[model samples]
Target chain A: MMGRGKLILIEGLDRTGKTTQCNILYKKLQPNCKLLKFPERSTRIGGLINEYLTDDSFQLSDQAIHLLFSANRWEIVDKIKKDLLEGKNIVMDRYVYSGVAYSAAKGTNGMDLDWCLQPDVGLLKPDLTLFLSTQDVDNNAEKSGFGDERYETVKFQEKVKQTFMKLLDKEIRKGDESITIVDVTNKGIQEVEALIWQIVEPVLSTHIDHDKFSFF
Target chain B: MMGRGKLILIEGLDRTGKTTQCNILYKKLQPNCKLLKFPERSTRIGGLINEYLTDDSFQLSDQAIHLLFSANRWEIVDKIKKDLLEGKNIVMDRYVYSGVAYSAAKGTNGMDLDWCLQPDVGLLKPDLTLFLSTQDVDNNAEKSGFGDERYETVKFQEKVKQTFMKLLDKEIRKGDESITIVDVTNKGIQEVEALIWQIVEPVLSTHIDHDKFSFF
Candidate 1:
């Protein structure tokens, strides 16, 4: 029986060291793991999303911008799935949750969480979602090169946090048992990594059959 | 007084002559009209959707596949909107309806019609939709090497048709005054074009002070 590789996602509010930790984990996994970040600003669709994020003057409908973010994921979904099935651990900085949480914060008519989630219905659900959370706003605000992009405003970030919490409690908790929320307040990167390992190791140790991916 | 351009979407089952009519209408509109087709398969995101649609061996979870299709649209959404706002008529060859109908037929857990629609929430709503319907399957089957793609089977096409009908009845009908169903049972290409003109001319003639956009 060939084991399916671990699908691990690092999710959180802005400046929670997700990018740094994702790099660290990807490096630690070495040749057996891959790192994928959302708003993959390299592809054509990503270029548009980047424009929307970076340039306020670049007007795109809220709906169009959200779809571009989702499209960025679709562009790489296959290769990611292929690598994971080949026994490669996959680490994502953010996945569907960001797309949902960020867009749901827009508060557009009919553009609620349910609407933002529609286009991503059939995409692969991650095996384990590691949500990085912290209560320290000063530390987050002081991070280098913060306050960039459209959704990076402090107020909007708060709304996103609230949306994520609501989704986690209402949707993921009911269906997925593999979700682990890690509070990284005052914790170093290594300490957070250790905490992640403790939660993930037991599941990796067991030979479990898993199917039915969730989009929550 | 600056008037916004019309958004005309031609939707139907594959090989129902959407592309042809869109082209004819686009040509008729001359320099002021633009033509955009879904699965704009030239971009990187589109390349992925094309691969999935063309190759059966490439395994993407149904969810991932649907997102790829929606993402393909997102890739070009800005250009579509820009053209429309610039007072250039946009003739779309299949859009949100096809995106919803095709994926909804799959019947995945989160990939229902409503679910498939979520990601596209906030995208432009067509000002005029010309839904092309036809009953001559044998004629289409005989037309120049059919059954080349994954979703082209007769049985699957039937399911897609049923899904489109239900989607139209539920979503598009609320604004039925905006949608015109053109049944091309035994009509020639020219005849179909004439019918589309009859439906489109009246809507184009009337100017309304509605700048509101529609979302899923």
Candidate 2:
């Protein structure tokens, strides 16, 4: 009997401690887990994205950049699937949710949700998607070193949040996917990690047959 | 009244004399004309695509690469539209047609016609599209340096040819767009050039209103 690993995705705005949480989660899962990040900047396409993000002078169309972001996630599909099949739980920091949210935040014409999600239509679906956000932006603990890259502005993030909520709400109402929004405002990193573990534990405990898998 | 320039696209399989014809046409219309090629390799996204094409070890998801190719075309949308509005005729060596045809040829799952064309849905449409192909591959003028890049195989080309025909036929049967297929199997370069000129001259002569433009 082959036990397939669960796919867990941690997605959030910049400075939401997604990477930190992903690292913690990965450590808890230990040697049996693999952790990955979107815009995996080491690859050639990811390198191009890194340039676009870091260099304001770098040029790419909004549509093209959006697709490139989506492409970045797709570049890892096979490996992600393979690791999961080999009983290795995978933790991802940002994935398709960010790709759609950030791109939709641009408010560009003709790149609606359907268009944004099309390129990643058949990707493997995540078993658990935890969207992290800050609750009391007015009095939340200060987030350091933000706004260094493109789409890091407060106003733009408002758009990303709204778009992300739309997606999550739709998925939740449909009751076909598992998604949770965690508010980490004024919370300690360890407390947040504990909360994430509470949500993730049951998903890990569930037995998923290898033959009955879902795709995006 | 500002006269809008004609947008002409030359699309074909590998070694189909598309570049040669585009060069000849461009020379005749030089000084006031802008000649652009698809997978515009100078841009960051296109540079990634070039690496993927030339390097077999270089990895990218077919979906990502398809969208990258589309993004390469989109990277030039504003410029193409600007040039057209300024009354500068634009000649393209390859454009969206090649993008869709090549990607669809892969016959990958979840990347059908709709998926392949989604990334380029709103690109500026060409006023005239000339699809060139060889009449008799068994005895046509031999093409040189064809196998250096990816997706350059006799069998794969057969798939590309079928996919290209499907696209051209759909557009032609709709009768809303301008498209022409030219076979240059045994023809001399000059003869093919003359044939293309006869088709392109009418489009150039026609007066296009700036407000009455079309997009992909």
Candidate 3:
């Protein structure tokens, strides 16, 4: 019975306002939309992940934390598929990209891209991924609550950014759709949101009975 | 005029006795031969990597360290090419495989297979890579200088070994030769060496001119 349901992901480093942008897009498409974020903090595994990210005392092996992030996604995998099956659009603030980017940046033991990605294998891929980025993110980092949590450093963010690009390289090692890089550099919130909407318009409009896309 | 001098890489996790095996292989192919290792500490860039790897105080970003490992290879790259051009077969104890493996295992700061592989781009690749493996590498970890440096843990080395296998997969994205996994488990040094020799003998015996392999 599913004829039209699009999975759109808004991905980017912190301070890029991906959360705000996703919310903006979601409101415009609501009633028939589902909003999801990785490390879906409400889930059982996500609770432990929240402790690791927010509290300094929460000790988790980098590998463990990486898996927990992917597991958080798995927690809601059924719901996401169900919503999509019902012809509702799914707008995600973050997903596999953020998981891999954040964990891979840690460069901790046994947490390479593949390791970070292993748990995410066969996860639903987005029809269109809007990568909100800035030309010089370090200079534009949102200074508020900068060091309050893990992965807040600009240096680490830079590595995460590099990884995002490499994963998007049309080289297709994973064979996923190319992520659309939306440059929010020197742009306003409304302006950046508009850019993302422009790129996602085509995907949102299309309808097809098809095999669901998967992570390459 | 360029033929002979195949690049034979002796690759493996610690305690697989890769170093000792490389030495043996080198001696048998000596007279007009060369031997190379990663973190080639003799080079200028290699010096910094040596410090970061050995000294706890020498803090370098994972991104920076990954590049340095590549730079260390570049330091002697010219000499390696020239030697091979002059018909000198070489044995490398470690090289790109190690750089990718060790850094990937760390899963540090977005240092996945692609990130670790990016810096070493355009460098020469091996003709035959002998990945010295064990049935259980953890059980075979280097007992001598155990816990002296980073990347020494059997658990982490296990991850690194996994990365090496994915890298040499038949559907290669980076496009290097498939690494031959040589099981050294339950075999003496001499026996393992003999196994490696059988693999290398044929590649060494054959001769073909032109078209050098580069980092895939």
Candidate 4:
């Protein structure tokens, strides 16, 4: 059998422990898993995205900025695919969901959720998407460092959560069965991991046809 | 009369003198018009976009890179608008057209013109869109130095031109009366500038209503 690595994406709103869990998952996967984050913030494109996210005085049009965020992802897409093909399981902290959710939150005229999703079309779809959710925002905000980036507001994060849920319902769960939603409300890190494992174990044990790759 | 600065956009396929003319226009409108370029390589996001455009080894997903380009624009969007409102005529080398044309040219995931245009919805529509077109590819590529970036291929340029034409016919021309198509085939630099001047003169003369700004 031709060995193809699993593509596992961990998606969630802010303060859901996505980064921590992704890091732990990466370490646990040992030599088998590779970790990647969106707004890779180090590349030339990422640098611009970072500025947009951090600085309030910096100027850009909504349309222009939306494309920049999308471009940041395009900059690293190939490497992730290559690593996966090389038999390295990939863990994405956030990917298309963040792009769609954040931009949709802006409510630009032509830039709707469908529009934001267009640029991401035909890119690699995750083998299994793990959505991290938390019920309470006030509690989560106090725990996670807040008020640093543009989308870090409690109200905005709530909207983002709603948008994310809508996207999950429409894109991942409607017709597709590859997505797994894990609610991390008041749950320990290990417990969350166990929940993720429960979802992932069956998919990993089964054989995946190398011919199929999902796209937006 | 409330004097609103002009938002002038010069759009065309690669090597069609957009940058040159934009600079010239900026110089001519100096102290009054602010010049902005798409993929403004000076910013942190622009740096990543530049790398993606210049280096093939720098791997990024099509989706990721596209959003980065959009985000780069978002970072500077407010500033562009503010400059215009402050009575500074804004001269942009490239903006929405480049975003639409290049991504549409990719034809990925059935990302047709309309789909490609979705992410850019609600961006500031140009007050005057001057599209520069040339007859032959040789003029663009064989000028002095040739072939520098990722999307600089002759075939791709041709496709981009077609896409630009479609965008004009379908969007700008159909919706707004201020758009002008200037054919630069075998035209000298002075001639091209003169042609652009004819298109921009009336728009500059007319009064702009700030409330008229609509997202396409």
Top TM-score model:
2
Residue B104 displacement in candidate 1 (angstroms): 2.1
Off by over 4 Å in 3: A1-216, B170-178, B209-215
Clashing pairs in 2: none
Q: Which is superior by DockQ, 2 or 3?
A: 2
| Candidate 1 local lDDT, B1-216, one digit each (tens) | 467788889999888888999999989887988999998998765776788788887656566567667766765777887887888888999998998999899876656877777666566788888889888755766666578888887888888888998988876556556777789988999999999999987876666766555544
Could you estimate the TM-score for every candidate?
A: 0.71, 0.94, 0.50, 0.79
User: Candidate 4, residues A1-216: lDDT per residue as tens digits?
Assistant: 675888888888877888888888888787888889887898766676678788867766666666666666766777887887777888889988888998788676666788777767657889898998888673544344545677777888878888888888996556987877888999988998888888876766676666657777
The residue-by-residue lDDT of candidate 1 on A19-130, one tens digit each, is: 8888888887778788888878987667777777788788666765777777678768878768866777888888888888888887876678877776665678887888
Error of 2 at A55 (Å): 2.1
TM-score of 1: 0.71
RMSD of each: 5.5, 2.1, 12.6, 4.1
Candidate 3: give its CA RMSD in angstroms: 12.6
For model 1, the interface Cα RMSD in angstroms equals 4.3
Q: Which digits, one per residue and each the tens of the lDDT, describe model 4 over residues B1-216? A: 558788999988878888889988888888888998898898766787799899988877655666666666667777888887788899998887788788878876656777666656657788888888888975677755567799888888888888888888887557677678899988888989888887777777788565366555
Per-residue lDDT value at A162 in model 2: 85
Candidate 2, A21-130: lDDT as tens digits: 99999999989999999989987778888989988989888988888888888888999989988899999999888888788777888788777877778888889999
Docking class of predicted structure 4: medium
Off by over 4 Å in 4: A1-4, A23-31, A39-69, A83-88, A102-112, A136-156, B23-32, B51-65, B106-112, B148-156, B172-176, B208-211
lDDT of 2 by residue, B78-106 (tens): 99889888889999988888888888888
| Each prediction's DockQ against the real complex | 0.32, 0.78, 0.02, 0.51
Instruction: For candidate 1, give the lDDT.
Output: 0.78
lDDT of each: 0.78, 0.84, 0.73, 0.78
